[model samples]
Each structure stands twice: as structure tokens, then as C-alpha cells.
Target: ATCDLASIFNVNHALCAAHCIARRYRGGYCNSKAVCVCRN
Candidate 1:
């Protein structure tokens, strides 16, 4: 969920940007560098 990932630690700007650009994205995890990754 978007809230779940956003609430967690990290919450990188990249992730937010991806979410904004992505179509129907359901949130995802971030790497050590705090980069937002696409979820399945």
C-alpha cells in the first residue's frame, strides 16, 4: 500500500517521483540508497 511504504523508513524522493509518474502503482520497497523500486 502507498501509506505502508510511505510510512516506513527511507521514503526516498525517487520513490515518490516514481509513484507520481507510474500508472496504477501500488507502492514498493526502497534500496539501501533510498531509491524507490517498482513492485509486482
Candidate 2:
């Protein structure tokens, strides 16, 4: 389960950083740009 402490605690920078890292990491696995890192 995701804690999502950043969003829950209002850490916008952490949330954005998570998203940015997620985006970068996701690109290496998915075939579509719309997909975020869901599976390994």
C-alpha cells in the first residue's frame, strides 16, 4: 500500500519529485507515455 505521505501531508515538492522520478522510471518499462510506473 502507498503511504502517500507527500500528498497527505501537503509536501508539494516531494509529490512533484515523486512524479518526476516516477515519470522518468516509468518510461523505461511502458509502451505508452500516459502510463505511470505501475508494474515492475
Candidate 3:
């Protein structure tokens, strides 16, 4: 799956990743910097 780790607002990207399903991605987790991290 792909990812869109762009910072759109003052929030944790992980929260955005949580909606991976909407973007045709599988479940994922966050990184050390609090960013969206995804996988198969």
C-alpha cells in the first residue's frame, strides 16, 4: 500500500493513517515522529 504522510494540520499523522482503508491501504502504525506508517 502507498502513503500520504504530508502534514495537513497541527495533528498526529497517525490519526490520518487510521483511515488507510479509505485510501485503499491496510492497517498501519505511527513512527517515532508521530507520522503515518503503512504496510501490506
Candidate 4:
């Protein structure tokens, strides 16, 4: 559900809030050396 949102750590976390929610997903979380996570 995402990619680089500035950096893989800092802005990347905060930035994904809108990206995932727009798809009607339940929520998401920022991971290490990773990207947005999709869940129910």
C-alpha cells in the first residue's frame, strides 16, 4: 500500500496515514527497512 514517503523512517511513517486509509483499510504501521502494512 505504499513506498518512500520522504524517508524510510521519519516522514515515511506519518505520511502513510492518508495513503492507506484512502483504500478503506482498517489501519497501518511503519516497519524497519520496510513499507506500509495493510490489515483488517
- Per-residue lDDT of 30 in model 4: 51
> How many backbone overlaps does candidate 4 show?
0
TM-score of 1: 0.30
Worst 10 residues of 2 by lDDT: 27-36
RMSD of each: 5.8, 10.1, 6.9, 5.6
TM-score for each of the candidates: 0.30, 0.25, 0.32, 0.34
Name model 4 segments beyond 4 Å from true: 1-9, 34-40
lDDT of 1 at 21: 52
Write the residue-wise lDDT of candidate 3 on 1-40 in tens digits.
2333435542444456567756777656556554556543
Structure candidate 4, residue pairs in collision: none
State which candidate has the highest TM-score. 4
Evaluated at residue 25, the lDDT of candidate 2 is: 41
For model 2, residues 1-40, the per-residue Cα lDDT tens digits are 1323333343333343455557664322222332223332
lDDT of 4 by residue, 1-40 (tens): 3444536364554455666567786556655546666443
TM-score, cand. 4 vs. native: 0.34
Give Cα distance to truth, residue 35, candidate 1, Å: 0.4
Q: How many residue pairs clash in each candidate?
A: 0, 0, 0, 0
